[PDB]
Amino acid sequence: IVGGRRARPHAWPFMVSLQLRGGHFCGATLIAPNFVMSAAHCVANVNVRAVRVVLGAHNLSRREPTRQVFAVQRIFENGYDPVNLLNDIVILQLNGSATINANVQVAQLPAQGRRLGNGVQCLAMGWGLLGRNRGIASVLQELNVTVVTSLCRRSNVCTLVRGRQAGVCFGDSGSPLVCNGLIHGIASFVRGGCASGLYPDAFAPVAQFVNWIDSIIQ
Numbered sequence: 001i002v003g004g005r006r007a008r009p010h011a012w013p014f015m016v017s018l019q020l021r022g023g024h025f026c027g028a029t030l031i032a033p034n035f036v037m038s039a040a041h042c043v044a045n046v047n048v049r050a051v052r053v054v055l056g057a058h059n060l061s062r063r064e065p066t067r068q069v070f071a072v073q074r075i076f077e078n079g080y081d082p083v084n085l086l087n088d089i090v091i092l093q094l095n096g097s098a099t100i101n102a103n104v105q106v107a108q109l110p111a112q113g114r115r116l117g118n119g120v121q122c123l124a125m126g127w128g129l130l131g132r133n134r135g136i137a138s139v140l141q142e143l144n145v146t147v148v149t150s151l152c153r154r155s156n157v158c159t160l161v162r163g164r165q166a167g168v169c170f171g172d173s174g175s176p177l178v179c180n181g182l183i184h185g186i187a188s189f190v191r192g193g194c195a196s197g198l199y200p201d202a203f204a205p206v207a208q209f210v211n212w213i214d215s216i217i218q
């Protein structure tokens, strides 16, 4: 997240870090005690057996006893198209069930088909790059963003920060976009580099996938 702010610790208890060999590479969202959702492109070319699903995290540079770590048992896909980055969503079934507590909680999802228009105010978040040269965040970042339809496909939810250069960045893919308390996006791609101030950030449109999500988390 470029131009955001540190989240209060455990403000977003559905927020997940996906890690390989102890390094964060993508976000995810806890959607049931034994399932997370992320971007399909995050796991498309990764050793899934090596992915660690880290719940309850805030500062990835510190030892945190609030954390719960799981492996991926199974993946569920829904027509990911890597050339066009369409249907950029995956569900990862965990090898066990999270202990739900103040710091680890399931997210709330919108109704199937709900489409956000221009001007909805959302919060993006993640542990991705902080900007040019500064690397992956240590502390979870959040960012106020606004939904836009200009320079967005109908197959995405897009957002833009007005009046300054800010937005999501590499390592934020898979992270939730929260709008009126509900997870309406999964971070998918940028254009023109991160935080261009021109192209909106593109998210997988969670509401288009809710019946499918519901069918899996049973």
Ligand SMILES: *[C@@H]1O[C@H](CO[C@@H]2O[C@@H](C)[C@@H](O)[C@@H](O)[C@@H]2O)[C@@H](O)[C@H](O)[C@H]1NC(C)=O
Pocket: 049, 050, 051, 052, 069, 070, 071, 072, 095, 096, 097
């Ligand atoms: C679920 O998996 C947890 C994490 O396993 C660790 O991470 C994966 C990616 C592999 O590297 C594995 O060899 C590691 O041990 C375990 O800590 C936990 O006990 C498991 N829970 C159940 C219920 O099987």
